[PDB]
Amino acid sequence: GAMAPSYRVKRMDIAKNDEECVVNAANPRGLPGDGVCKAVYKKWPESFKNSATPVGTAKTVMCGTYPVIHAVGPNFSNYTESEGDRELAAAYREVAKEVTRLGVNSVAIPLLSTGVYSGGKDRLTQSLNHLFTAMDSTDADVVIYCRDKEWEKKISEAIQMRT
Ligand SMILES: [Cl-]
Ligand SMILES: [Cl-]
Ligand SMILES: [Cl-]
């Protein structure tokens, strides 16, 4: 575990993270995809061997000894708000189980279903609150990666609010 487990947020490419493992915002078919998934494919392509996994699940594949946790959030274009919410909560619970199993002291994580799977809605708060629900019982340092300046401020505020 980390000595004083924390949450932090950084505005940069998750492929440049300084953590012991990464969470990919994966598609269910283990394809290179777009956004975070394409950056992860360019940095850790070996981790896409047999990475396909259903919506609401996480599957870890090693790139050398570096763990890539493929977490499949729902595409809110295809799911109802209710069912999508349940699958998005489930994907994060599976990430917490993998982080715990791996024994890492730190993890880099994007906000699942906030990009092209958002169904054109702002899901910062929904996705971040499911992240917290899952990760709060873990003792890993969590570093959240984002690309938007306003999102960085809102994520930083939500972390500081609870400290
Ligand atoms: Cl960058
Ligand atoms: Cl997404
Ligand atoms: Cl963002």
From Swiss-Prot:
Membrane topology: Peripheral membrane protein
Post-translational modification: Phosphorylated by host on serines and threonines.
Phenotype for residue 117 to V/W: Almost complete loss of mono-ADP-ribosylhydrolase activity
Domain named Macro: residues: 4-163
Entry's localization field: Host cytoplasmic vesicle membrane
Result when mutating residue 36 to E/F: Almost complete loss of mono-ADP-ribosylhydrolase activity
Result when mutating residue 27 to R/Y: Almost complete loss of mono-ADP-ribosylhydrolase activity
Effect seen on changing residue 117 to A: Partial loss of mono-ADP-ribosylhydrolase activity; complete loss of ADP-ribose 1'' phosphate phosphatase activity
Domain of life, source organism: Viruses
UniProt signal peptide: none
Residue positions binding ADP-D-ribose: 13, 27, 35, 115-117
Domain notes: In the N-terminus, the macro domain displays a mono-ADP-ribosylhydrolase activity. The central part called, the alphavirus unique domain (AUD) has a zinc-binding function. The C-terminus region, also called hypervariable domain (HVD), is mainly disordered and binds several host proteins. This intrinsically disordered domain contains 2 SH3 domain-binding sites and 2 FGDF motifs necessary and sufficient for the formation of nsP3/G3BP complexes.
Task performed by this protein: Seems to be essential for minus-strand RNAs and subgenomic 26S mRNAs synthesis. Displays mono-ADP-ribosylhydrolase activity. ADP-ribosylation is a post-translational modification that controls various processes of the host cell and the virus probably needs to revert it for optimal viral replication. Binds proteins of G3BP family and sequesters them into the viral RNA replication complexes thereby inhibiting the formation of host stress granules on viral mRNAs.
Subunit (UniProt): Interacts with mRNA-capping enzyme nsP1. Interacts (via C-terminus) with host G3BP1; this interaction inhibits the formation of host stress granules on viral mRNAs and the nsp3-G3BP1 complexes bind viral RNAs and probably orchestrate the assembly of viral replication complexes. Interacts (via C-terminus) with host G3BP2; this interaction inhibits the formation of host stress granules on viral mRNAs and the nsp3-G3BP2 complexes bind viral RNAs and probably orchestrate the assembly of viral replication complexes. Interacts (via C-terminus) with host NAP1L1.
Protein name, per record: Non-structural protein 3
Residues of the full protein shown: 1334 to 1493 of 2474
